[PDB]
Design a protein around this ligand. Sequence first.
Ligand SMILES: Cc1ccc(S(=O)(=O)NC(=O)/N=c2/[nH]cc(Br)s2)cc1
Ligand SMILES: Cc1ccc(S(=O)(=O)NC(=O)/N=c2/[nH]cc(Br)s2)cc1
Ligand SMILES: Cc1ccc(S(=O)(=O)NC(=O)/N=c2/[nH]cc(Br)s2)cc1
Ligand SMILES: Cc1ccc(S(=O)(=O)NC(=O)/N=c2/[nH]cc(Br)s2)cc1
Lengths: 317, 319, 317, 317
Amino acid sequence: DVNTLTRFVMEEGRKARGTGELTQLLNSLCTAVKAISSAVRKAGIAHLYGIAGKLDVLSNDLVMNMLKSSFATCVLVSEEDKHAIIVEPEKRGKYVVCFDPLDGSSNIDCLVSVGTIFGIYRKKSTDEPSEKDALQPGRNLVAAGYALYGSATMLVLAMDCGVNCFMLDPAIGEFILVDKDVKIKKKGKIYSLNEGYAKDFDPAVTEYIQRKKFPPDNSAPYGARYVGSMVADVHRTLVYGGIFLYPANKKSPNGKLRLLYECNPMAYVMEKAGGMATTGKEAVLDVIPTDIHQRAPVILGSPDDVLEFLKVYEKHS
Amino acid sequence: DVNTLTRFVMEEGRKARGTGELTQLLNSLCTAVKAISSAVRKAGIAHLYGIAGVKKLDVLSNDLVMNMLKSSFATCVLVSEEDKHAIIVEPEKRGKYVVCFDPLDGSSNIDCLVSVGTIFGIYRKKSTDEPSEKDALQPGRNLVAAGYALYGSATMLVLAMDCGVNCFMLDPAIGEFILVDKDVKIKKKGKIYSLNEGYAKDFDPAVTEYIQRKKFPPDNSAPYGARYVGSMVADVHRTLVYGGIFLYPANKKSPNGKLRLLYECNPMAYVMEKAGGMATTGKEAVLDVIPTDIHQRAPVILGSPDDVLEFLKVYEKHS
Amino acid sequence: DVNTLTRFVMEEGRKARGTGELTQLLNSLCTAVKAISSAVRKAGIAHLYGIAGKLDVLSNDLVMNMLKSSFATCVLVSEEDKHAIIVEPEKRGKYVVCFDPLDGSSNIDCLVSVGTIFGIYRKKSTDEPSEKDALQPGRNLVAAGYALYGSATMLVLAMDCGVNCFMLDPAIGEFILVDKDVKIKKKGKIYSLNEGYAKDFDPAVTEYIQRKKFPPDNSAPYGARYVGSMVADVHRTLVYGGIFLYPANKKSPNGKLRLLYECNPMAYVMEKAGGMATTGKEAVLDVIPTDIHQRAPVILGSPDDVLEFLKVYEKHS
Amino acid sequence: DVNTLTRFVMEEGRKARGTGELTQLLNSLCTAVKAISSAVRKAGIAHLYGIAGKLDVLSNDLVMNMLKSSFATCVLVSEEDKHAIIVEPEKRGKYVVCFDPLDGSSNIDCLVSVGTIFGIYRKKSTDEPSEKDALQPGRNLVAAGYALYGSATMLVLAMDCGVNCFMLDPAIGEFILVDKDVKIKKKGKIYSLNEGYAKDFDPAVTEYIQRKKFPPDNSAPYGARYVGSMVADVHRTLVYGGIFLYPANKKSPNGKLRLLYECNPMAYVMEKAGGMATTGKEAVLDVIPTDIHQRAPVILGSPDDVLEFLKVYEKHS
Ligand SMILES: Cc1ccc(S(=O)(=O)NC(=O)/N=c2/[nH]cc(Br)s2)cc1
Ligand SMILES: Cc1ccc(S(=O)(=O)NC(=O)/N=c2/[nH]cc(Br)s2)cc1
Ligand SMILES: Cc1ccc(S(=O)(=O)NC(=O)/N=c2/[nH]cc(Br)s2)cc1
Ligand SMILES: Cc1ccc(S(=O)(=O)NC(=O)/N=c2/[nH]cc(Br)s2)cc1
């Protein structure tokens, strides 16, 4: 039969016999995502242009408010906020959420695909809630995923049961399950990085990309795609296979992408989908964060592709 | 004051004192575009998935455009990416314009939900002969109007005409195109370069060289960022908004490029030139090319003028 | 072949070879109506209720602003404004528009169908446009109709060429031509009036209604329907046939409905559709207004039904 | 704090500490209602008119399929289907659902308000599920309500915690709690019935209505309203108070409205709001049904108004 996101989550939660909190958080998040989708598609823009006589802030406000009021959260970390948000005592629940409410928005002016990326942890320590509760390795993720506001809006949700993709049907405002237990290709034909940083690349990265353009065994070169918007680039990587890279430009040394709410969620999605995600040195999901907005290098995608890069990384030691 | 596409056009048309065919054609088109936009954002998909118990998007999009154009009484010859021959409008529906269009550009990668778009170029039919394929064989210089609908984070229609380039945001709450950016002009020089670097092994050495200088400037300037969506409407629209350069050039394996002249290159070239940008094949302005085939390919390097002029410096260097 | 409101009006205007000014007005009002529909259906209500942490006024503002900026109007009469709005000289066109922007909205609280009613005249005096340009008998109407915000949104447009009905497809925000050159049934099976005012009725109304319930020719009695929203009641009258009545009572001794922006447009639509519209004493469209918020009584509908009523009104002298 | 239907119900569900089945059911019903609303507002109608070159049926399909696939139901009664639908064993839950998927659909061609009515029971026998399970008096209702597709879409949900009203925001496809624990007025000023069938009225109904229009004291008559679609008339009755009647007579000894999926749900909502619902002889919720499609007379609304009706009824019995 047809399924929706909310119902899919309920049936999985009923199965697991949990208290409903995660389902409440997820339903709340999905309401925020639909409100973000609507704003992003410029619903009501006419009224802003005088018909009757901020988007990242709005999106942040939407997710913060939906999550605070879900009663399922205690600590909230956002790209938009300098410090962690500690939910008021009355609204505290057992989950910690790290999110980027509108990823890729700094270039929304060219109507590039944007998205919301999120990572859900259970609060691990019994101490009073604090920024420290978001400082868990990605391995500790209970659920993660993203809404892509692309040609269409899709919510990708990763949990222990696997990766499932839900398309927003805007006619009824419902997320419809369209891809079940998603697995990424073992190897793709596309590579994805900002090559304008060629000048700064590792010997490892440079040689790997070199192999994609000029394969040693005369095979067809990988095609190149780089939207410049992480959720868009990562989604294609899931759907089509291949590799996405945002390495340290030795000139911006800890990577550019944020660990808690960009790298981890996607690494989690990748791994649940049979993919891999590395910093080069260790699994993304194994980094023990010390800071909520800390950055990481990230290379992710099909396992044969990522493995191929790690072989190159290791030749260069 | 608020303005909309239809009403922007009607006003421009009354100032021009025309008969109304172009306004009628353009209103038909933007209706098709709102239908394509609704389809692309997957309205009604729940019903494909059995909520209550067929045409691909590029096909539906072609039928939307063809139908609304044929029924506009403003067109006589229609060239589409989807159709082998030019469609000749039936005598009772014939009007004065020839429209060349790609109904869903970038469609082959619509599965990853990358931005897609509709590209159109509108010509006045130039002779009184019985309409045929030849009516579409005009250089881009002859365009009366051109542009694109980009189905991205939001849907935007960009219309180029003699009065310049105007950007219209689709408000899906009311299905109106709202004028948001007027008389748009591109930056003289940008900081972004756009092409598929994966096929570098097939590059023309001048392309190889130009792109190297973007990544390794011999002058202490910051290197250019790279962006490549792989969707022409998306890539060209970023190029318009932020400046810089977009390349789909010729090589040995493809001496005439990959992109189609009539309904991909010419409309984008026209928008670009109206915006103070440039569009070249390497050998001449894309708008100066005389087509001999409606599905004729051309190379296209377009964008900010200083960037395009710089590519031409290197291109010449390789003869 | 498919048609839309805007393109319908364009080809009609093209045929009449006019200056496009009427088309421009109608397209602007079209846009206002879609904006009104969206607000009536409560798009964005979540924002009012705190998701991110007056309808009749808005409707007036939408109609006012779009018509002013159409460059096609000079005088604007609304149920919402005590006086005619005189368009600033830079925006003046040749048409007078009388409209009720959200007819039936005092009861919008129960989700009753509401509507927008409009009538369009050519201005009269080469002088200043003035409140007096709106003071024309309905017979002088260039165009009239309504948008009904019912179970679906429909725009009914009456002009010289007849009455045409357009359904708003909310998926693409376009008015689709669904009913061409509509003609009302010669006689219906439904009557429509507020019978709560029975105690106040003149004897003619009393006898006519009594005939609908207790037919003298022993035929089937007429059904009763009264939404209490003129647009809804008149639309049903148009589609199904029958009769709509708003006669005089003690609280409303010259009727309750406003001549300029309720009765005339509906009368004009009725007449163009082969129905009738009388005040009892005369054709609604023959009444010369002396005030812009002047009230008139109205009996309208299928020709036989309205004739039958006039013959009873005739009897009671 | 903003609240949504699904979250409100989840929160009430977690408070009751139930298994989640009712929440699952109500969420699935909620989705079908959104799909009904979209179809009813005519989304996609441009495609029926050849832009690219049912409603009662579709609504029935939507509700049935959403309910079957919910894993919450065992027996489904629809106005549309003679026999109860017995859900397959692999899809079986504990609830019996009685519904009218599109009330007032006959008169959808004039775009007047339509609605969806539902009543939800717990299966009480340990027998194999069968029609007999739907044969419970309204007093056994676990939940009941309706969606009205009027000028906006609203879902009214009555449960043991009372009556809550949720507006659909079409921009995001969410039911937003807008009226909490609603209570009906003790006495209203409107009466609602088809007065075109006066010749066939019960003498008690004739007298009651005569009293509303010509009150024996000097006092002001009631207004009359009759949309002719039960959901619209009952909802106005809920919002503004007064009385709705679809009573019995000698030609219709059991009235014409359906007990299980019309009268019961509205009686339940009415009673939970502090109003009354009667057949004249007993409470609607007290009738033991012997047939899933049986009719009941129904008089409902403000208690003072129903009480006054019943005093007249007792004068003629
Ligand atoms: C995969 C998953 C999802 C949710 C959960 S959960 O939140 O901890 N539990 C839970 O939802 N329980 C329910 N009971 C009744 C309903 Br309806 S939902 C656990 C695992
Ligand atoms: C820039 C431009 C656009 C359209 C045209 S057009 O189609 O040839 N003319 C035209 O529309 N004239 C009108 N008449 C009345 C109305 Br309303 S619009 C010309 C120039
Ligand atoms: C029935 C009717 C409608 C409009 C008019 S009108 O406004 O006075 N003229 C007019 O529209 N002319 C045009 N022709 C082509 C276009 Br595009 S617009 C007249 C009659
Ligand atoms: C008023 C009412 C509503 C629902 C129910 S219910 O369905 O039987 N229980 C239930 O939902 N329990 C939940 N637990 C966790 C979640 Br999320 S939902 C009971 C009472």
